[PDB]
């Protein structure tokens, strides 16, 4: 049974958080500790529910040899009760998660910016919805650095 859990969150769960989830899953799978972890991603919004990751994100993960398979889903009340960590991308995500967390029965989760783990101090993982392939590459690299640091030692 899993003993550790992380939910990556962004606005739509189509660009940033599916990438963070996929990067993190590859780390724990390659280290044969995936059975210890629950890894997932979700949206603050219901707008994209059911949709796969953005093809720019799919292309970026294919180039880097990272498996990614996801259907967008909106965060639920249950998620605040069950996850150890909710790691989000930007200041608006953090405000939205903190507001929802204050209105549910149980908040087990520590809610933090994923970028707070970056040794290169690029705090915000910026929404690449209107962005180019370079902007997706920047997001991927932020996720690589932050996910490695989080797996090494959680705040
Ligand atoms: C369109 C937009 C303007 C300012 C800041 C963010 C976005 C913005 N980023 C988005 C992203 N990464 N993925 C999907 N969408 C579609 C969407 C819309 Cl149009 C409206 C409410 C929620 C969502 Cl999810 C995004 N919209």
Resolution as reported, in Å: 1.3
Ligand 1: atom nearest CA of 16 is: 12
Query: How big is the CA angle at 77 (ends 12 and 37), to the nearest 5 degrees?
Result: 75
User: How far apart are alpha carbons 129 and 108 in whole angstroms?
Assistant: 31
C-beta of 42 in contact with ligand 1 (< 6 A): no
20 membership: H or E segment, kind and range: helix 16-30
Which whole-number Å values give the CA distances from 2 to 32, 37, 56, 112, 125, in the listed order?
13, 5, 32, 21, 28
Report CA torsion sign: 15, 135, 59, 61.
Answer: negative
Using CA atoms in the order 30, 82, 114, 41, what is the torsion angle rounded to 10 degrees? 70
C-beta of 127 in contact with ligand 1 (< 6 A): yes
- Could you tell me the two tokens for 54? 């953005």
79 membership: H or E segment, kind and range: helix 77-82
Q: Which domain holds residue 25?
A: 1-155
Q: Assess contact for 80 and 100: CB atoms under 8 A.
A: yes
Buried b / exposed e over 34-51, threshold 16 CB at 10 Å, is: beebebbbbbbeeebeee
Q: Which residues are catalytic?
A: 10, 16, 127
- Could you tell me the two tokens for 90? 């930007």
Report CA torsion sign: 53, 57, 62, 66.
Answer: negative
List, in sequence order, every beta strand (DSSP E) within the chain: 4-10, 37-43, 85-88, 110-113
Question: Experimental technique used?
Answer: X-ray
Specify the number of domains making up the chain: 1
Region of residue 65 (left: phi > 0; alpha: psi -120 to 50; beta: else): left
Name which of 6, 2, 49, 17 is nearest 128 in CA terms: 17
Alpha carbon nearest to ligand 1 atom 7, residue: 129
When computed from its CA atoms, the radius of gyration of the chain, rounded to whole angstroms, is 14
């Amino acid at each position: 049974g899993a003993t550790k859990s992380v939910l990556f969150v962004c606005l739509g769960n189509i660009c940033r958080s599916p990438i963070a989830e996929a990067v993190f899953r590859k780390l724990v799978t390659d280290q044969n500790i995936s059975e210890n972890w629950r890894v997932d991603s979700a949206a603050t919004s219901g707008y994209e529910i059911g949709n796969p990751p953005d093809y720019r994100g799919q292309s970026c993960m294919k180039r880097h040899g990272i498996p990614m398979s996801h259907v967008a889903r909106q965060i639920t009340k249950e998620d605040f009760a069950t996850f150890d960590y909710i790691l989000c991308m930007d200041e608006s995500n953090l405000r939205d998660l903190n507001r929802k967390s204050n209105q549910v029965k149980t908040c087990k989760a520590k809610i933090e910016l994923l970028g707070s783990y970056d040794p290169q101090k690029q705090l915000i993982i910026e929404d690449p919805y209107y962005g180019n392939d370079s902007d997706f590459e920047t997001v991927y690299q932020q996720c690589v650095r932050c996910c490695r640091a989080f797996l090494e030692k959680a705040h």
